Design an enzyme around this catalytic site. Structure first.
Site, short mmCIF file in Angstrom:
data_model
loop_
_atom_site.label_atom_id
_atom_site.label_comp_id
_atom_site.label_asym_id
_atom_site.label_seq_id
_atom_site.Cartn_x
_atom_site.Cartn_y
_atom_site.Cartn_z
N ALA A 49 -3.42 8.92 -10.36
CA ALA A 49 -3.35 7.48 -10.52
C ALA A 49 -4.62 6.86 -9.93
O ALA A 49 -5.44 7.56 -9.33
CB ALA A 49 -2.12 6.91 -9.86
N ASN A 92 -6.97 0.43 -9.09
CA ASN A 92 -7.81 -0.69 -9.49
C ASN A 92 -7.12 -1.99 -9.12
O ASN A 92 -5.91 -2.11 -9.36
CB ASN A 92 -8.09 -0.70 -10.99
CG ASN A 92 -8.32 0.67 -11.55
OD1 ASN A 92 -7.49 1.22 -12.32
ND2 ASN A 92 -9.44 1.21 -11.24
N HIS A 140 1.27 5.09 -2.61
CA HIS A 140 -0.15 5.34 -2.39
C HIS A 140 -1.04 4.32 -3.07
O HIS A 140 -1.90 3.73 -2.41
CB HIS A 140 -0.49 6.75 -2.89
CG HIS A 140 -1.90 7.19 -2.62
ND1 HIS A 140 -2.22 7.99 -1.55
CD2 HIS A 140 -3.05 7.00 -3.31
CE1 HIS A 140 -3.52 8.25 -1.58
NE2 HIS A 140 -4.04 7.67 -2.65
N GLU A 141 -0.85 4.07 -4.36
CA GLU A 141 -1.78 3.17 -5.02
C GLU A 141 -1.62 1.75 -4.52
O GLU A 141 -2.61 1.04 -4.36
CB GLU A 141 -1.61 3.19 -6.54
CG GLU A 141 -1.80 4.57 -7.22
CD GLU A 141 -2.96 5.38 -6.69
OE1 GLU A 141 -4.07 4.85 -6.47
OE2 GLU A 141 -2.78 6.59 -6.54
N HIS A 175 -3.39 1.33 -1.14
CA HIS A 175 -4.83 1.15 -1.28
C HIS A 175 -5.23 -0.31 -1.37
O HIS A 175 -6.38 -0.64 -1.18
CB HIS A 175 -5.36 1.84 -2.54
CG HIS A 175 -5.77 3.28 -2.37
ND1 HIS A 175 -6.60 3.72 -1.37
CD2 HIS A 175 -5.50 4.36 -3.14
CE1 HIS A 175 -6.81 5.01 -1.51
NE2 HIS A 175 -6.16 5.43 -2.59
N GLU A 201 -8.94 7.55 1.60
CA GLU A 201 -7.95 8.50 1.10
C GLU A 201 -7.12 9.16 2.20
O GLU A 201 -5.91 9.29 2.06
CB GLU A 201 -8.59 9.56 0.21
CG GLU A 201 -9.17 9.00 -1.10
CD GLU A 201 -8.18 8.21 -1.94
OE1 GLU A 201 -6.95 8.36 -1.74
OE2 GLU A 201 -8.65 7.47 -2.84
N1 LIG Z 1 -8.38 6.93 -5.74
C1 LIG Z 1 -7.59 7.75 -6.68
C2 LIG Z 1 -8.31 8.94 -7.25
C3 LIG Z 1 -9.54 8.56 -8.07
C4 LIG Z 1 -9.87 9.26 -9.43
C5 LIG Z 1 -11.08 9.97 -9.55
C6 LIG Z 1 -11.40 10.59 -10.79
C7 LIG Z 1 -10.49 10.48 -11.89
C8 LIG Z 1 -9.29 9.76 -11.77
C9 LIG Z 1 -8.97 9.14 -10.54
P1 LIG Z 1 -6.12 8.24 -5.79
O1 LIG Z 1 -6.50 8.97 -4.57
O2 LIG Z 1 -5.51 6.83 -5.37
C10 LIG Z 1 -5.06 9.26 -6.87
C11 LIG Z 1 -4.38 10.38 -6.05
C12 LIG Z 1 -3.05 9.85 -5.60
C13 LIG Z 1 -2.41 10.67 -4.42
C14 LIG Z 1 -3.14 11.58 -3.67
C15 LIG Z 1 -2.53 12.28 -2.63
C16 LIG Z 1 -1.20 12.06 -2.35
C17 LIG Z 1 -0.47 11.16 -3.10
C18 LIG Z 1 -1.08 10.46 -4.13
C19 LIG Z 1 -4.17 11.70 -6.76
O3 LIG Z 1 -4.82 11.74 -7.99
O4 LIG Z 1 -4.68 12.71 -5.91
ZN LIG Z 2 -6.03 7.40 -3.16
#
Ligand SMILES: N[C@@H](CCc1ccccc1)P(=O)(O)C[C@@H](Cc1ccccc1)C(=O)O
Ligand SMILES: [Zn+2]
Length: 866
Positions: A257, A260, A292-293, A296, A315
């Site tokens: 995810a 944005n 998580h999203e 952010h 992150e």
């Molecule tokens: N900032 C996002 C990643 C950016 C990205 C780069 C290239 C292509 C598409 C997206 P995120 O960290 O919020 C998504 C993340 C969500 C997550 C991670 C760890 C635990 C729980 C949720 C998972 O994909 O690991």
């Molecule tokens: Zn993230």
């Protein structure tokens, strides 16, 4: 001449962008993007350098055609005004040709974006770095019948119709942001509407966009978002800052995810569920990632990253926040152990291998290679150590000061650390090494009771990693307790306080801790709650481990005692199998497991974890000249022994779990715990008695009351050599042919099977009408699963290596991000026994010899080979 980016070379940008006005004209096949940038000189007179890889149609400066040069992926204008000026760039994109799924791309007949980290430059020419923050306004024009839904960040401030069937919208995002947080969606999508009222009394309109067919599966995601919004208010005091929050599901997506601003874009996997088609774990995943999203919005968006080396600033912190959210929802101890287990199974091998890096890397060639277990999960453990050192109140004081200082800014890991230190009046200088030193620290501990003092001596060491040899002592909190002979808690004096638990702060290479006033013989409980992300060695007898497992009050240390017994049993199997003699009796282990099975006071999901055997990668940690099949064989032998020895009791535990689930087939943490235990039992039963599959098949419909049960049964039989296994999988694919997320499960079963014929079944699956190599979910499910399938990937004839290397080469032609993750299947290379090492090096050299190999894959291959 190969480009490496170094943190030490950071310099503030020569230009800022105050305003970003965008116009998208969507046509068939091309989209034309016009930009207008309001540029503010910082270092007057420098050339203006813009990043960009889209087709360039025109460039203006202050409205006149610009004198510029295009070189590689940069656009340079030498003759810049010394005063505020504008630049207007016109680019042309063919989104249906974009199989990288970065920038602007097509999926399911709709258009989506992914800009983090450096995708925005695939849309227009820009200063595409996160310390440049600008206020965006976005106009979108498209055919109304084909693209009725037109979204971008922020507030919809205008729109209208044209007589030729086109329509338009204008979106204004009032919060300055870096380009990586830009999003656009254009499509025929269904909407699910809800709302949340903030603690200041402002309604927030919630809109989830999905396909029409997928809409009935989005409700749990919506509920989870409202839970996440409330939690950030109650736990962190953080409120949302717009009156609209949009989430858009997309089936083609490189990660899980994306946060944005006001317009999150999610992989379908982390937003769609119902009990018929999604497992309990899938529901837990949606809750985690929706959280998580949303989290952010503050830890990432309101305060962002100065540069990409600081990725863990957002992150690690946001993973910590999603972990705490999930633990506050339900089952905190079990979920904490799940997190520890994933770290040790996936992150520890990273830190021990050729791609090891610090939580804050000092260099990179391709930033997409650093969205790693280290940056995320070890990053979260680092944030959690602030919590352990400071307490919740102190941690929240740090959070408060962090936002006070840095709201609206792009900052560094150092700034987060300083906010924590300064808010609490404590020196955290040594703590900086958690960001700059890679590798898993190893603690060597010894304990003695002499007089009435338990003297605990602890040494720490950190190995060289490819980036850095010198590793200095770190600040390592070690939470401890003591058990007497009957496994009762024993109190002790530490730092003038009498308690049953203390945090021992190891800051030197070697220290002795004096636990005073100890009146009975003790066994210590160490690293409680997994209080630091380290390897701890303490000399425990088998009987000590049984005591801890039976009586310790901390979930992690109990579970780690079991893990240790399993590890020792596998080691004993390795020895006998190697000496060509009978397997060990494992009498004490079997007695320990019998106790766990029969204990009705154990939480069901915790019991399930106590019955899980460490993975092969955990088992060969620290070894040289590894034959992965020998480790696989030894682990399988232990599982076989456990399966056959306790077969009647596995059936009984299954029956008890079924009764307690009580036909409550919807997702709840309570019912899920029983199903987790049930699925452990099924796995053992079908190991011991593979013929039981025909009994299962006969009553399959009665059993299949939700996807947790279908997945659990199909997983249990997946390695079965009966034809019935193949028939059940075929029926599963037929039943769920129209649900792409369930077809991912089918392909994962195909790729992960321990049956002898898995390679050819995988090659047939490549041609399945529902498989697409260009879809990351499908590629990950089939090919990724095969690459982690130890007996097949590491087949002695090298067929697994050749197959995966072929697919790295093929995938790299259209999606380097997926290919660079896949090629890390080879990371064990230099630790393999010579025959396999030779074959892995041949495979990597063949990948390297590819004309036009991506920087992404080349960086990883170089780390393994060179
Ligand atoms: N900032 C996002 C990643 C950016 C990205 C780069 C290239 C292509 C598409 C997206 P995120 O960290 O919020 C998504 C993340 C969500 C997550 C991670 C760890 C635990 C729980 C949720 C998972 O994909 O690991
Ligand atoms: Zn993230």
């Amino acid at each position: 001449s190969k480009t490496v980016h170094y943190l030490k070379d950071y310099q503030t940008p020569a230009y800022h962008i105050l305003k970003t006005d965008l116009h998208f004209d969507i046509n068939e096949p091309q989209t034309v993007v016009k930009s207008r940038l309001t540029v503010e000189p910082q270092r007057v007179g420098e050339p203006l350098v813009l990043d960009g890889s889209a087709k360039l149609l025109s460039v203006k400066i202050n409205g006149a055609a610009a004198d510029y040069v295009l070189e590689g992926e940069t656009l340079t204008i030498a003759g810049v005004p010394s005063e505020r000026f504008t630049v207007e760039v016109e680019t042309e994109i063919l989104p249906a040709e974009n199989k990288s799924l970065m920038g602007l791309y097509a999926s399911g007949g709709n258009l989506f974006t992914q800009c983090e980290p450096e995708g925005f430059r695939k849309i227009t020419f820009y200063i595409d770095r996160p310390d440049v923050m600008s206020k965006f306004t976005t106009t979108i024009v498209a055919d109304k019948k084909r693209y009725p839904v037109l979204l971008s960040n922020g507030n919809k401030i205008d729109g209208g119709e044209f007589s030729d069937g086109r329509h338009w919208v204008k979106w204004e995002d009032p919060f300055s942001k870096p380009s990586y947080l830009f999003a656009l969606v254009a499509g025929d999508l269904a909407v699910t509407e809800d709302y949340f009222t903030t603690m200041s009394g402002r309604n927030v309109k919630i809109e989830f966009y999905t396909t029409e067919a997928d809409k009935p599966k989005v409700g749990f995601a919506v509920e989870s978002l409202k839970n996440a919004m409330k939690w950030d208010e109650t736990r962190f005091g953080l409120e949302y800052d717009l009156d609209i929050f949009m989430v858009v599901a997309v089936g083609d997506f490189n990660m899980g995810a994306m946060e944005n601003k006001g317009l999150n874009i999610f992989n379908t996997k982390f937003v769609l569920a119902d009990s018929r088609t999604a497992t309990d774990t899938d529901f837990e995943g949606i809750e985690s990632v929706v959280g998580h999203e949303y989290f952010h919005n503050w830890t990432g968006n309101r305060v962002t990253c100065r540069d990409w080396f600081q990725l863990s600033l957002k992150e690690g912190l946001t993973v910590f926040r999603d972990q705490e959210f999930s633990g506050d929802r339900a089952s905190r101890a079990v979920r904490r152990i799940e997190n520890i287990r994933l770290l040790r199974q996936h992150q520890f091998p990273e830190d021990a291998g050729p791609t090891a890096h610090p939580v804050r890397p000092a260099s990179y060639e391709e930033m997409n290679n650093f969205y790693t277990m280290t940056v995320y999960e070890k990053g979260a453990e680092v944030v959690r150590m602030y919590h352990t050192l400071l307490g919740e109140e102190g941690f929240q004081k740090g959070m408060k000061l962090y936002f006070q200082r840095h709201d609206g800014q792009a900052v560094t890991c150092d700034d987060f650390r300083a906010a924590m230190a300064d808010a609490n009046g404590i020196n955290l200088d040594q703590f900086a090494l958690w960001y700059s030193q890679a590798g898993t620290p190893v603690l060597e501990a010894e304990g003695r009771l002499k007089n009435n003092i338990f003297e605990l001596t602890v040494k720490q060491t950190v190995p060289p990693t490819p980036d850095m040899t010198d590793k200095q002592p770190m600040m390592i909190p070690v939470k401890v307790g003591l058990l007497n002979r009957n496994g009762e808690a024993v109190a002790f004096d530490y730092q003038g306080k009498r308690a049953t638990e203390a945090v021992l702060l190891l800051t030197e290479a070697e220290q002795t801790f004096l636990l005073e006033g100890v009146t009975e013989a003790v066994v210590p409980s160490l690293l409680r709650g997994f209080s630091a992300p380290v390897h701890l060695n303490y000399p425990y007898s088998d009987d000590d481990l049984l005591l801890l497992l039976a009586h310790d009050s901390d979930a992690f240390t109990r579970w780690e005692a079991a893990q240790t017994l399993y590890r020792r049993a596998v080691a004993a199997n390795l020895a006998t199998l190697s000496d060509g003699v009978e397997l060990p009796k494992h009498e004490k282990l079997l007695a320990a497991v019998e106790k766990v099975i029969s204990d009705d006071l154990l939480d069901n999901a915790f019991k399930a974890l106590l019955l899980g055997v460490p993975s092969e990668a955990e088992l060969w940690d620290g070894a040289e000249n590894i034959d992965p099949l020998r480790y696989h064989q030894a682990r399988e032998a232990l599982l076989d022994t456990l399966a056959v020895h306790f077969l009647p009791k596995w059936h009984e535990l299954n029956r008890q779990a079924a009764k307690q689930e009580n036909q409550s087939y919807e997702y709840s943490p309570e019912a899920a715990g029983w199903r987790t235990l049930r699925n452990v039992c099924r796995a053992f039963v079908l190991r011991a008695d593979p013929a039981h599959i025909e009994t299962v098949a006969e009553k399959y419909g009665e059993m299949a009351q939700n996807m947790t049960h279908e997945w659990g049964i199909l997983s249990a039989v997946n390695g079965n050599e009966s034809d019935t296994r193949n028939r059940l999988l075929a029926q599963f694919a037929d039943k769920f042919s129209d649900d792409a997320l369930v077809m991912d499960k089918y392909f994962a079963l195909v790729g992960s099977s321990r049956r002898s014929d898995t390679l050819q079944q995988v090659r047939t699956a490549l041609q399945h009408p529902k498989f697409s190599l260009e879809n990351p979910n499908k590629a990950r499910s089939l090919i990724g699963s095969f690459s982690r399938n130890v007996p097949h990937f590491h087949a002695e004839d090298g067929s697994g290596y050749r197959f995966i290397a072929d697919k790295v080469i093929e995938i790299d032609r259209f999606n380097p991000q997926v290919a660079a993750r896949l090629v890390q299947a080879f990371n064990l290379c230099n630790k393999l026994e010579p025959h396999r090492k030779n074959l892995v090096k041949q495979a990597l050299q063949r990948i390297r010899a590819q004309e036009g190999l991506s920087k992404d894959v080349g960086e990883i291959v170089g780390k393994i080979l060179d």
